[PDB]
Amino acid sequence: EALPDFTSDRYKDAYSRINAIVIEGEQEAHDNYIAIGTLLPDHVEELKRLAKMEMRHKKGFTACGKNLGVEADMDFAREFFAPLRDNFQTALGQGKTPTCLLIQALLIEAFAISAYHTYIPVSDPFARKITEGVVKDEYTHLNYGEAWLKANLESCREELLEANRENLPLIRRMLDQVAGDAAVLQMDKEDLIEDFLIAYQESLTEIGFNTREITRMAAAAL
Contacts with Fe ion, residue ranges (CB under 5 A): 26, 29, 54, 57, 141
Q: Nearer to Fe ion by C-beta: 89 or 139?
A: 139
Q: Nearer to Fe ion by C-beta: 26 or 181?
A: 26
- Minimum gap (Å) between residue 145 Cβ and Fe ion: 10
Q: Which helix (H) or strand (E) holds 217?
A: helix 211-218
Q: Nearer to Fe ion by C-beta: 57 or 117?
A: 57
Cα 64 to the chain's mean position, in Å? 18
**Backbone φ/ψ region at 208: left (φ over 0), alpha (ψ -120 to 50), beta:** left
- Minimum gap (Å) between residue 215 Cβ and Fe ion: 26
Q: Nearer to Fe ion by C-beta: 10 or 49?
A: 49
Q: Is 57 annotated as a binding residue?
A: yes
Q: Nearer to Fe ion by C-beta: 11 or 18?
A: 18
- Minimum gap (Å) between residue 128 Cβ and Fe ion: 17
- The H-assigned helical ranges of 71-108 are 74-93, 97-101
Interatomic CA distance for residues 191 and 176, integer angstroms: 13
Residue 134 identity:
V
Q: Is 43 annotated as a binding residue?
A: no
Q: Is 26 annotated as a binding residue?
A: yes
Reported as half-sphere exposure (CB side, CA atoms, 13 A), residue 199 has a value of 29
Interatomic CA distance for residues 159 and 153, integer angstroms: 10
Helix (H, G, I), strand (E, B) or coil at 125: helix
| CB 187, CB 1: distance < 8 Å | no
Residue 195 identity:
D
- Minimum gap (Å) between residue 160 Cβ and Fe ion: 19
Q: Which residues are annotated as a binding site?
A: 26, 54, 57, 109, 141
Residue ranges at the known binding site for Fe cation: 26, 54, 57, 109, 141
